Design a protein around this ligand. Structure first.
Ligand SMILES: [Mn+2]
Ligand SMILES: [Mn+2]
Length: 191
DNA sequence: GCCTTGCCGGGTAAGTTCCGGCGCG
DNA sequence: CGCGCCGGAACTTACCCGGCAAGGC
C-alpha cells in the first residue's frame, strides 16, 4: 500500500531514535508529539521530513513538521494528537505486520539503531521483546541471527545478524525498493 | 591463519520532559 | 475553563563504534 510501508519505516525510526509523547502541562493543557532525532541535518531535512510530510498529507493531518536544532541533535517533531495515536495504534499491532511492513520497519530500525559500517550487522536496544519480534521476522526471511546482552553497564541487548547472511540481509532488507530506501542503500547501488 | 562473533569500555548521538506561548469551543 | 498545536532547549544515558580475543573451520 506504500502508505503502509512508509508508515512502518517511519515507526522504525521513531521507536529507534525518537518517540511518542503524551504531555501534560499547566493546566490542564496537553500536547501529543511524534518525534525523530538525528545528528545529521541532511538525513532529517532531505530524507525523513519528505516521508513524514507525505504521510501527513495522505492522513489529512494539518499539523506541521517542526525541526528544532538542539545542542546535540536535530529533532523532527510533529505536534498532532491524530498522528500520535496513528503511530501508537500501529505499534500496538506490531506483531500483525505483513511482510512489506516488516521489512520497512526493520529498515527504519537499522537506520536508527544499527551498525552503520556494515562490517558488522548489529541492532542495539534495551527492549529485548522488540528485538525478539524482529528476530523472528529475520528468521522467517532466511536471515540467521542471535540476541545477547551486549552492554552489562546499561542493560542494552544487541541483535547480531550472521555474517553468513550478510548478502541476503543487505540487498533484501536494506536495499528493498518496496519501502523508503535508506540513504546509503540508495547510494549502495547508484554507487 | 583467517573469520565470525561474544563481550567489553569510550563517549556522543540520541531520547524525555520541562518551559512559555497561542487558538479553540 | 479545559484542551490541543507551536517553539525551544535543558537534562541524562542508551546507544553505536571499534578493539580484543575465544572459538571454529
Ligand atoms: Mn533507541
Ligand atoms: Mn541512531
Amino acid at each position: 500500500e506504500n502508505v503502509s510501508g512508509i508508515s512502518a519505516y517511519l515507526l522504525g525510526l521513531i521507536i529507534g531514535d525518537g518517540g511518542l509523547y503524551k504531555l501534560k502541562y499547566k493546566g490542564n493543557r496537553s500536547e501529543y508529539r511524534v518525534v525523530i532525532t538525528q545528528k545529521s541535518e541532511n538525513l532529517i531535512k532531505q530524507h525523513i521530513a519528505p516521508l513524514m510530510q507525505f504521510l501527513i498529507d495522505e492522513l489529512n493531518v494539518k499539523s506541521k513538521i517542526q525541526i528544532v536544532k538542539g545542542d546535540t541533535r536535530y529533532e523532527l517533531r510533529v505536534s498532532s494528537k491524530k498522528l500520535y495515536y496513528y503511530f501508537a495504534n500501529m505499534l500496538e499491532r506490531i506483531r500483525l505486520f505483513n511482510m512489506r511492513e516488516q521489512i520497512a520497519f526493520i529498515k527504519g530500525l537499522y537506520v536508527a539503531e544499527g551498525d552503520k559500517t556494515l562490517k558488522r550487522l548489529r541492532i542495539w536496544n534495551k527492549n529485548k521483546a522488540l528485538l525478539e519480534i524482529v528476530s523472528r521476522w529475520l528468521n522467517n526471511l532466511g536471515v540467521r541471527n542471535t540476541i545477547h546482552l551486549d552492554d552489562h553497564r546499561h542493560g542494552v541487548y544487541v541483535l547480531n545478524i550472521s555474517l553468513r547472511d550478510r548478502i541476503k540481509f543487505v540487498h533484501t532488507i536494506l536495499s528493498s525498493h518496496l519501502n523508503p530506501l535508506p540513504p546509503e542503500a540508495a547510494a549502495l547501488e547508484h554507487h
